Amino acid sequence: QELQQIHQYIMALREEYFDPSIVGWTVKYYELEEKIVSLIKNLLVALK
């Protein structure tokens, strides 16, 4: 459960202090990271 909270905090840190040029190159990229996060989540389930 805390994996998602860490992901959300790291995600909010991108816009709470920085103003990058475009959003699409970022957010989609961000979603890619979530994929790996999901993968980690998956492993957790397997571990259980």
From Swiss-Prot:
Induction: Up-regulated in response to enterovirus 71 (EV71) infection (at protein level). Palmitoylated; structural requirement for proper assembly of the hydrophobic core of the lipoprotein particle. It comes from the Eukaryota. It is found in: Cytoplasm; Secreted; Lipid droplet. Apolipoprotein B is a major protein constituent of chylomicrons (apo B-48), LDL (apo B-100) and VLDL (apo B-100). Apo B-100 functions as a recognition signal for the cellular binding and internalization of LDL particles by the apoB/E receptor. It is linked to Hypobetalipoproteinemia, familial, 1: A disorder of lipid metabolism characterized by less than 5th percentile age- and sex-specific levels of low density lipoproteins, and dietary fat malabsorption. Clinical presentation may vary from no symptoms to severe gastrointestinal and neurological dysfunction similar to abetalipoproteinemia. Interacts with PCSK9. Interacts with MTTP. Interacts with AUP1. Interacts with CIDEB. This is Apolipoprotein B-100. It comes from Homo sapiens (Human). The lineage of its organism: Eukaryota, Metazoa, Chordata, Craniata, Vertebrata. The chain holds residues 4372 to 4419 of 4563 of the full protein.
